[PDB]
Amino acid sequence: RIRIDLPQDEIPAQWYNILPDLPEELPPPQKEVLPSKVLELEFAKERYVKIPDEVLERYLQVGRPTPIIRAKRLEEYLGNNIKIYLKMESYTYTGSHKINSALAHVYYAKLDNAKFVTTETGAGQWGSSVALASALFRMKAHIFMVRTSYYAKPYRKYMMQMYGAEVHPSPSDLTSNHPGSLGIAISDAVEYAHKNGGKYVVGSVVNSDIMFKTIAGMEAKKQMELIGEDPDYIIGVVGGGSNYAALAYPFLGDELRSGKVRRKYIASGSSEVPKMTKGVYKYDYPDTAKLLPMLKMYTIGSDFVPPPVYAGGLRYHGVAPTLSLLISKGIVQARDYSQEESFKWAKLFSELEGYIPAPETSHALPILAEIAEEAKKSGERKTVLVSFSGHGLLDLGNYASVLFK
């Protein structure tokens, strides 16, 4: 009884849409390449949206529902002051939550009779997720991978290729050895989709994309209800915020409706990319390519470039608009930790629990230490539910660059 399995025939059948439940309307922003039904869901007004049959089928295909695991050996290390439950989005075939939305974007593109889909990727997480979704929907995928990552971090490129996708170093020939960047790769992929009748699958922080990922939180609420455990804290890490919102919003939405928020919601980023603790809540460009409307979000600037030493994976400059609203209203609390502190926790967690977290995920572990410290003072036990967003088996080089000389 470490693992809480949800049977596949009990998988939730709807996504959760937080918009009708937000304290106040979201600041408004300030269509040829996007799947049509995706743009439409960005304004959805109903609280629950049915997961299409074909999408749910492939959720089951890629390993959903994912388990919750109780991290009892970590609990002991922390003095048994808190109980720790991990929602294991790492258990999907691509090793993260990203496939939860990649599958939906590809489904809706297929419904627009897309000839192929395109997308950008840096280190390869989003690209490999889109490559898997495309294979399962029998769709041709053209992935534009920053040339530096295309050569430095080749394994996820090989993964995309095993799934049948064509991986193009950005900038490429279709379009001397310009190392590229993520913003060029977005333009590099958005153009190829525009001039060849493809659709662009957006790897950014829109509302529809959080909604698709909320299958994780819908499952977790069922699983926690299955063992009779109501979490006092829900925590996670913020690249753009989609993985954390996906877990928390199904729980938080019911609190917002009932009037009172009882649970504590805490999210972390990297202090080398400190949008969570040093970012400013204002309109900014959600992608470094500067196309896509501006939205009001916590941000350290779409032009921010992480230090070369940074290997923690939370490189994005901003926070999803709904999550930013929640933070500015005091509903979600913010933290930031260094990669040395986080990767030290990742190593400890690997030895204690046996499972190597993604470097991104490791930034949630210092939160647990803080909650345990407050519990020791209070001194009342608390239950924490963690978005365990990925595993680290394709990121061991990141860990090595910091931990192993």
Ligand X SMILES: *Cc1c(COP(=O)(O)O)cnc(C)c1O
Q: What does 404 bind: ligand X, its own copies, none (CB cut-off 5 to 8 Å by kind)?
A: its own copies
Q: Phi/psi of residue 230, each to 5°?
A: -100, 120
Q: Are 199 and 114 in contact (CB under 8 A)?
A: yes
Minimum CB distance to its own copies smaller for 8 or for 196: 8
Residue 238 beta carbon to ligand X: minimum distance, rounded to whole angstroms: 5
Distance CA 331, CA 310 (A): 29
Please report where in the chains the tokens 């698709």 appear, as a residue. Answer: 212
| Interface pattern 125-144 for its own copies (x via CB under 8 A) | -------x--xx--------
Give the span between the Cα atoms of 158 and 366, in whole angstroms: 33
User: What token pair was written down for 171?
Assistant: 């900038």
Applying CB under 8 A, among 18, 66, 75, 95 the residue interacting with its own copies is: 95
The one of ligand X, its own copies, none whose footprint includes residue 369, by CB under 5 to 8 A per kind, is none
155 binds, among its own copies, ligand X, none (CB under 5 to 8 A by kind): its own copies
Interaction partner, residue 353 (ligand X, its own copies, none; CB < 5-8 Å by kind): its own copies
Phi then psi for residue 254, to 5 deg, are -70, -30
Stretches 27-35, 333-341, 347-355, 377-385: which one binds its own copies (CB under 8 A)?
A: 347-355
Q: Give the interface segment with its own copies, choosing from 36-44, 152-160, 235-243, 277-285 (CB under 8 A).
A: 152-160
Please tell me the distance from the alpha carbon of residue 187 to that of residue 120, in angstroms, as a whole number: 9
Binding mask 161-180 for its own copies (x = CB under 8 A): xxxx----------------
DSSP secondary structure, 115-165, as one string:
S-EEEEESSSHHHHHHHHHHHHTT--EEEEEEHHHHHHSHHHHHHHHHTT-
Q: C-beta of 360: minimal distance to ligand X in Å?
A: 3
Return d(Cα 164, Cα 145) in angstroms, integer: 15
> Which residues on adjacent β-strands are paired with residue 168?
144
User: Which residues lie below 8 Å from residue 161, measured CB to CB, with a gap of 6+?
Assistant: 131, 167
| Contact partner at residue 93 from ligand X, its own copies, none, CB < 5 to 8 Å by partner kind | its own copies
- Under the binding rule (CB under 8 A), the answer on residue 158 touching its own copies is yes
- Identify what 397 binds: its own copies, ligand X, none; CB under 5 to 8 Å per kind: its own copies
Q: Assess 9 for contact with its own copies (CB under 8 A).
A: yes
Instruction: Tell the smallest beta-carbon distance from residue 2 to its own copies (Å).
Output: 5
Site residues for ligand X per CB under 6 A: 96, 98, 125, 237-243, 358, 360-361, 389-390
d(CA 147, CA 187): 14
